[PDB]
Amino acid sequence: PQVAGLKVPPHSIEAEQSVLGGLMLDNERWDDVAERVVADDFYTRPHRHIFTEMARLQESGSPIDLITLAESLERQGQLDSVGGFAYLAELSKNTPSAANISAYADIVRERAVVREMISVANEIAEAGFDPQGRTSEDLLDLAESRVFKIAESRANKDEGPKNIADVLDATVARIEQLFQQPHDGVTGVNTGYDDLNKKTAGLQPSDLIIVAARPSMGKTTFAMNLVENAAMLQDKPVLIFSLEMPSEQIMMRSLASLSRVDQTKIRTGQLDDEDWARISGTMGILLEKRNIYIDDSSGLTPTEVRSRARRIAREHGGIGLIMIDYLQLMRVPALSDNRTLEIAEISRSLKALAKELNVPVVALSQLNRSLEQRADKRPVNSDLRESGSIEQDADLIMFIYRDEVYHENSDLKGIAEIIIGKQRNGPIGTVRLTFNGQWSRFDNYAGPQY
Amino acid sequence: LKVPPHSIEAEQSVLGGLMLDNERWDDVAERVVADDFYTRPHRHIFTEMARLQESGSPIDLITLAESLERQGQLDSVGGFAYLAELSKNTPSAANISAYADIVRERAVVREMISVANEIAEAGFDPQGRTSEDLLDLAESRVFKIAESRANKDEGPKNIADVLDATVARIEQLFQQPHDGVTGVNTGYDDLNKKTAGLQPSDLIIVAARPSMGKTTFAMNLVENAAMLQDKPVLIFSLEMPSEQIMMRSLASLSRVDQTKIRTGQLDDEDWARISGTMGILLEKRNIYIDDSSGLTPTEVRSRARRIAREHGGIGLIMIDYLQLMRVPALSDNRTLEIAEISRSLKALAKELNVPVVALSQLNRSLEQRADKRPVNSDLRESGSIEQDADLIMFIYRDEVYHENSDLKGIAEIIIGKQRNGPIGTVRLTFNGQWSRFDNYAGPQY
Amino acid sequence: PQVAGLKVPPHSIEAEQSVLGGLMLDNERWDDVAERVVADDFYTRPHRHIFTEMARLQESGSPIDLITLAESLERQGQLDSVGGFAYLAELSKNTPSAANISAYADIVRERAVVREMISVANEIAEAGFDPQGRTSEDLLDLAESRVFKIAESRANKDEGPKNIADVLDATVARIEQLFQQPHDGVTGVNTGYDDLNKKTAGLQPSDLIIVAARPSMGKTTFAMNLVENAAMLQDKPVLIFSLEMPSEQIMMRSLASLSRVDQTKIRTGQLDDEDWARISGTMGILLEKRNIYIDDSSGLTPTEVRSRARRIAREHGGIGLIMIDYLQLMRVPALSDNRTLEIAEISRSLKALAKELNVPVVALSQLNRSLEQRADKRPVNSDLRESGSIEQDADLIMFIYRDEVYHENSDLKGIAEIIIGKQRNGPIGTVRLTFNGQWSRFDNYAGPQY
Amino acid sequence: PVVALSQLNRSLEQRADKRPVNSDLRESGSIEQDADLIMFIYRDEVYHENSDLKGIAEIIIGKQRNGPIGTVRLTFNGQWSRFDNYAGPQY
Ligand SMILES: Nc1ncnc2c1ncn2[C@@H]1O[C@H](COP(=O)(O)OP(=O)(O)O)[C@@H](O)[C@H]1O
Ligand SMILES: Nc1ncnc2c1ncn2[C@@H]1O[C@H](COP(=O)(O)OP(=O)(O)O)[C@@H](O)[C@H]1O
Ligand SMILES: Nc1ncnc2c1ncn2[C@@H]1O[C@H](COP(=O)(O)OP(=O)(O)O)[C@@H](O)[C@H]1O
Ligand SMILES: [Mg+2]
Ligand SMILES: [Mg+2]
Ligand SMILES: [Mg+2]
Secondary structure, eight states: OOHHHHTSOOOOHHHHHHHHHHHHSOSSSHHHHHHHOOGGGSSSHHHHHHHHHHHHHHHHOOOOSSSHHHHHHHHHTOTTTSOHHHHHHHHHHSOSSOOOOHHHHHHHHHHHHHHHHHHHHHHHHHHHHSOOSOOHHHHHHHHHHHHHHHHHTTOOSTTSOEEHHHHHHHHHHHHHHHHHSOOTTOSSBOOSOHHHHHHSOSBOSSOOEEEEOOGGGOHHHHHHHHHHHHHHHSSSOEEEBOOSSOHHHHHHHHHHHHHOOOSHHHHSOOOOHHHHHHHHHHHHHHHTTOOEEEOOOSOOOHHHHHHHHHHHHHHSSOOOOOOBSOGGGOOOSTTSSOSHHHHHHHHHHHHHHHHHHTOOOOOEEOOOGGGGGGSSOOOOTTTSOSTTSHHHHOSEEEEEEETTTTOSSSTTTTEEEEEEEEESSSOOEEEEEEEOTTSOOEEOOOSSOO | OOOOOOOSHHHHHHHHHHHHOTTTTHHHHTTOOGGGSSSHHHHHHHHHHHHHTTTOOOOSSHHHHHHHHHTTOTTSSSOHHHHHHHHHSOOOOSTTHHHHHHHHHHHHHHHHHHHHHHHHHHHHOOTTOOSHHHHHHHHHHHHHHHTOSSOOOSSOEESHHHHHHHHHHHHHHHHSOOTTOSSOOOSOTTHHHHHSSOOTTOEEEEEOOSTTOHHHHHHHHHHHHHHSSOSOEEEEOSSSOHHHHHHHHHHHHHTOOHHHHTTTOOOHHHHHHHHHHHHHHHTTOOEEEEOOSSOOHHHHHHHHHHHHHHSSOOOOEEEOOGGGOOOGGGTTOSHHHHHHHHHHHHHHHHHHTOOEEEEEOOOTTSGGGSSOOOOGGGOOSTTTTTTTOSEEEEEEOHHHHOSSOSOTTEEEEEOOOBSSSOOOEEEEEOOTTTOOOOBOOSOOO | OOGGGSSSOOOOSHHHHHHHHHHHHOSTTHHHHHTTOOGGGSSSHHHHHHHHHHHHHHHHOOOOSSHHHHHHHGGGTOTTTSSHHHHHHHHHHSOTTOOOOSHHHHHHHHHHHHHHHHHHHHHHHHHHHSOTTOOTHHHHHHHHHHHHHHHHHHSOTTOSOOOHHHHHHHHHHHHHHHHTSOOTTOSSBOOSOHHHHHHHSSBOTTOOEEBOOOTTSOHHHHHHHHHHHHHHTOSSOOOEEOSSSOHHHHHHHHHHHHHTOOGGGTTTTOOOHHHHHHHHHHHHHHHTTOOOEEEOOSSOOHHHHHHHHHHHHHHSSOOOOOOBOOGGGOOOGGGTTOSHHHHHHHHHHHHHHHHHHTOOOOOBOOOOTTGGGGSOOOOOTTSOOSTTSHHHHOSEEEOOBOTTTTOSSOSSTTEEEEOEEEESSSOOOOEEEEEETTTTEEEOOOOOOO | OOOOOOOOOGGGGGGSSOOOOSTTOOSTTTTTSSOSEEEEEEOTTTTOSSOSOTTOEEEEEEEETTSOOEEEEEOOBTTTTBOOOOOSSOO
16 A cells, blocks of 8 residues: 555655666766766665766776676676676666656655655654763764765765865965976966066966957957967867857968968969978978867857867866857857846856866957947947946956058058956056958067057 | 653752742753743743742742732642642752753753654655755754754744843953954954944845956955954855965965066065965964855855854855856746845854855946946846845945046945944055055045 | 455554654644544544543643653543553654654545545445335435534534624624723724824734835834834733844844934943943833743744744733744745745735734835836835735735935935825825934824824 | 557647657657657648648658658648659659
8 A cells, every 4th residue: 555655765766767778878968967966866776886887987988888887797796686787688778768867867866865864863863762871962963973974975076165275285386386487477378479478467277268349350360369379389288169160261261370371372272382381380280289179060058068178178188278259159048038148147157167177268259339439439348238247257358459440541550459358367458469461360569669 | 662851850859949949040040941841830930930030039939829820820830739749849959950951951852853853844745845955954953953052943032031142242242342343353443333343144245346356355354354353264266266366365465466476486575474474374274265166055055064063163254256156946037046045145144143245246237327336226136135135335446437537546335235234435445466455544535 | 355355444553553653752743633633533442532632631731742641641540441551652662753744644534534424325325225214304414414524523613604693792892891991092002103003093903014115214123113012012922033133133123222222332332321221121121021032033934933923822822913024035945936926825824824813913025126217216006026915915004215315405304204005994194203213213203294 | 560640749839840850759758769660740731821832741750760761752632631642843
């Protein structure tokens, strides 16, 4: 009957059956499950054992679907204790589609934690009635312990609140490591532009830089210049998620910058021996390193972006930089109707990413026309209208004003000034850069002052 | 075999030995309170006799009976015969302290089992609550007994039991110098007077358009309250990691600009301040920091409980750029998200007897006003925090929105809400390269 | 075999042991169980009589566990007669969690109905075949009364529908008891504001008052003044649920208001002898009385509010006032997905409480900030957006406006007006009061008409 | 072989194209897993009038265990309930 079954401890075996075989079908969602779920949150011995195997093996063994699991279990030699491969095959039979997993990873936690807490309550009571030579303070410190042990068994790392001295020693090691080598003016990533390295103090390793201007001001060119220089200097990856334009134009413009010959003398082939030599030079010095990876997709969400980036992270080493062109595309199905909160959540998640990996971010944007009808037309932070979320999240913003698009009579055609709208860890101001942009590159401007 | 453990002749013994010796009253009262006992009549006896020991000394048999008649309560305690049974029996000696002690012990136990059973109830019939919103309940209810010393975790409170704590509060400060302060000192001799210190149950909110160093101000607060006070503090930087936080606070102390530190070059003049503040900070270990990515309020509560379980009790908190906080279940709608956040914050602070400091942000419908001082109706996040809070401090600083304006190197603290006091406005300075506001010793505003 | 297991009347015995095992192990639940179960709902006579004692004691003698029960059970001569002490120990030995009771008392009621219906069906049929020379008129009224006796066995004796004449006797007795004594215009509770009792006839005793405003008008002060006054104007308790802020501030405020001194002379300590005199007076008047009870809780539900209140009601006297502060914090978690239904639930439940005890209920609120864009700002029934159920349940609503926040050039300084906006018994109006908040109290205003 | 007809949730409706797929079949995968062949169906005379597919029926196949997937065209003359083959432009 049910009355004899009512004393049962809550357990949801059905989803617990589904989840294992669902991950046997796919090892791509495995991290989001490993975080949210732990062994003891499985009810019985065998499922728990199988998840133990499937969790330890991905530290070393990539292939865990059906049979390398048998190789593992052989190296443990615990055949026919969970039924071995017999009941394992009975399990691997199940959920041959396994579309999604999240709720089936959450209800486990619900039932597991509830069961555990209630066992604890039972213990507290029946201990209070059978005290066994004990007194209140000792009677109750155990209660503190058994209550706070639960979530402590689920926390994973020292992610918790850092004592002061640890972060202190970390920062002091940074100061010392920097004190060894020359100052360089930089405390992070270099951009090449020495005049910019001062104000910015170098692109810092934990931030969400933003760059912005109307379309034909060529912000995209500047972003590619940044990643370009940062790739040639470092011994470390970079990444580029260009959305609007596919990659076979990206690389043409990249060679236009690196190689200082226009697109037209490349797509055609009118290039002289010196020009052939410089194209071959950029080719050969990129070939040795091969830092860049590119995803020239159509439209994306931050959730996919974290996966695509962390895959590169685990492939080799910590990354050095990221770029994102024309931010406004990156969707979110939840708020596909509204836009304000959409941009808010985008910026939020990208900040979270950049902190999750301790690496910078570039992330461009568009502006609103209305600065046209101000008659000075110089950008300010009020101009880009996205509810001003980015004006809060961002550790850095800067703008571009190429003089020649609006005015032509003026003599400063071909010069472009950067405006730094806001910076967290420094001052604001401006700089002056120059533009020989039939091959899409900026360079320094060693003129008189501004 | 099993029973909610009560002793019942110890109780009668205490009542009897308390009747004949009216003076034997503080030795008891320091150990026992009405709800500590088991039955109803003995409680009402105890509290009426307390009412009599207000002034009336003689309380054994007859004056008690007469008062208890005046409240019209005789014979609901048995009767006058059952009463005189007590003075008849138990002429015992002064083995009275340990009686009250064991009775208090039994009461603590009974309370413990009651809590455990409530936990089991809410484990079986959660009423849509998940586990996250359930461990919160459990840990709170247990912690309230474990930390607390008055061991009456839940219930209403009759008044005398409240006035005792109130007047102990009003007592302890007069002995020390009061100095206008109650709670925490910010170190700013003008703000202390408009505030009397960050009172230890209140949700403070800071609010400003970004480039104002509100982050800097809050760091300055927790810093000064880390050194003056001798209890922990917490700093949650959802805005940025701790390697920047450390440089900034250390800079604020040593009065050396950041651009010199991270550059890695500096003078003996500066080393003599760095080493010092390092050591003075290190021989306390006040601080704890968390450089997380995205937090719920429940995680905040959890971490805080574990801290105070370690040792003593915290005294200040700082949360950073509150809009990042997201309770995931209601991520689809934003207003209720903010409301639940602020609710949880308030209950946290009230639970631990602390202040809280929570930064925020503002809507840009103020810039077109052409005056640009903030006020209450400027922040549009449903106004869910305007109703929850106790203290607010907007910030304005003229040398952003103008270059030539003749208030250079000055900010100001526009207060817009005060739960226990009045409002005002204050003048402070800003030297943004070593990141510390200072007092404005000058004319008024 | 099992076939002969079908003619048995349905019953449960393990649940019947487990219930009593929990109740004997814990007294906190008797409300719920007695709100689901009655003596005859059990199977046999012993467990019936046991439940009889375990209710009839908690009527007056609260404690019922194992031996405080047996000490009464003996005096009716029933030891070693309903199972006895040795067997009765079994019930307290096993199931020492008291983990679930309510479920283990639902099914008993189910089977009890299912059995007391069938025992009636058979007893109707056999008489329908053994008519005894009866006639239908003498044969169907018994069946009526039989079927209805089932539901009568459960119903509490004093919740049914009353006749006109008894109610009318109560009414005339009320008017009589009034005319034995002056009237003062009051029909219940007094406040201290004679300007208010005329439009209100006092706080009536079975209602849901609401006191709504913008943040800084001072509603909290007003409610505290009300309960503060009704303390000394009565010989009967009160309650407060200061969900907003804890006791050590509330009592400072209350004390101060009673003694006409500012808070800033207490917590500072720069005060006079006249001061301490007026302090000790109100102190020694509060403590010779023992009316008030306070609850510095954090977050609550009506389900717990009812329990905390009824504990007070059953301990001593019947309460005569309540206050609840900053209502919005009251969680009822099942609905927290939504808010409109949440407020509807709370209002519904508080109304039901107040009427279940025949007492008033102050309860505060907040107003949405829509009025600001109107330039009149005198609040009205339309600007509170909390499902508008509070606009329906309430037998009274009294907003608060106070010009010297919005304007500062005021011809209307130190004056707070009370915009009543709804009434269920009297008429509407508007009251004019004065404010001097450095000690947080409102006062009368002997002044011009309006 | 065994034919076994079935029905579809209206969950497909709001998609603005309303051609079925496998995931449109909300049946806890109870036959998306325990099947060998599927052939969803569509007929554009239903959802839209200005669709230039008057008298068209297409056999959408979200799955075939033993072979390749596809997408196929037929006609429809429901006035006596029969399908024919399509001899027109390709697909
Ligand atoms: N053949 C060319 N002649 C002149 N300018 C060029 C040529 N090719 C590229 N550019 C410059 O490169 C810039 C890149 O701009 P664009 O890619 O449109 O910016 P965004 O990516 O923001 O749209 C252009 O604004 C343009 O002035
Ligand atoms: N080293 C520095 N040199 C010059 N200005 C600085 C320096 N550090 C900070 N600032 C200024 O101080 C302000 C601090 O703002 P911040 O602390 O980020 O508060 P918020 O997070 O609200 O912007 C910035 O506007 C910045 O311009
Ligand atoms: N100690 C004080 N001195 C001067 N004014 C005060 C003091 N305490 C409170 N006030 C004023 O009186 C008001 C009290 O109302 P309050 O309790 O804040 O109502 P609410 O809970 O609705 O905010 C405050 O808003 C404040 O303006
Ligand atoms: Mg572009
Ligand atoms: Mg900040
Ligand atoms: Mg209030």
